[PDB]
C-alpha cells in the first residue's frame, strides 16, 4: 500500500474529492534516495484529476489523505506504483518509491 508521513501540516479540513484537480509539487526517489523526477526542478507544479488514474495508484490513494497545504512523504510499494515490469531505464522492477509531495491547491 502507501504510507503517508506528514512533513508539514495542511489546513486539516480540505481533502481532495474524486474528480477534483490536485496541484502539487513533488520529488520522486528510489529506496536508496536517488532522485529520479521532480517538478520542483522544473519549477512547474504538476496537475492531475483525482480518480482518473492519470497517476500511480499510491498517489490516488495517498494524496486523497492529504489536506490543502500539507507536505508529506509517501512510501509506495511496487504493486501501487510500477509493478514487476517497472519502467526500464528509470524505475527498476519491484521498486518501492518514495515521494515528497506538497498539495498546493485544488481546482
Q: In the set 60, 82, 103, 104, which binds ligand NH4 (CB under 6 A)?
A: 82
Cα separation, 78 vs 66, whole angstroms: 21
**Strand-pair category, 35-38 with 71-76:** unpaired
Min dist. Cβ of residue 19 to ligand NH4 (A): 25
**CA dist., res. 41 & res. 74, Å (int):** 19
Is 36 among the residues known to form the active site?
A: yes
> Is 21 a binder of ligand NH4 (CB under 6 A)?
no
Q: Is residue 85 part of the contact set for ligand NH4 (CB under 6 A)?
A: yes
Q: Which residues of the shown chain bind ligand NH4 in the complex (CB under 6 A)?
A: 82-83, 85-87
The catalytic residue positions are: 26, 36-37, 56, 82, 99
Amino acid at each position: 500500500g502507501v504510507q503517508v508521513e506528514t512533513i508539514s501540516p495542511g489546513d486539516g479540513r480540505t481533502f481532495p474529492k474524486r474528480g477534483q484537480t490536485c496541484v502539487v509539487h513533488y520529488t520522486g526517489m528510489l529506496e536508496d534516495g536517488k532522485k529520479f523526477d521532480s517538478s520542483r526542478d522544473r519549477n512547474k507544479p504538476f496537475k492531475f484529476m483525482l480518480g482518473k488514474q492519470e497517476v500511480i495508484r499510491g498517489w490516488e490513494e495517498g494524496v486523497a489523505q492529504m489536506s490543502v497545504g500539507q507536505r508529506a512523504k509517501l512510501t509506495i510499494s511496487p504493486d501501487y506504483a510500477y509493478g514487476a515490469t517497472g519502467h526500464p531505464g528509470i524505475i527498476p522492477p519491484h521498486a518501492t518509491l518514495v515521494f515528497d509531495v506538497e498539495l498546493l491547491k485544488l481546482e
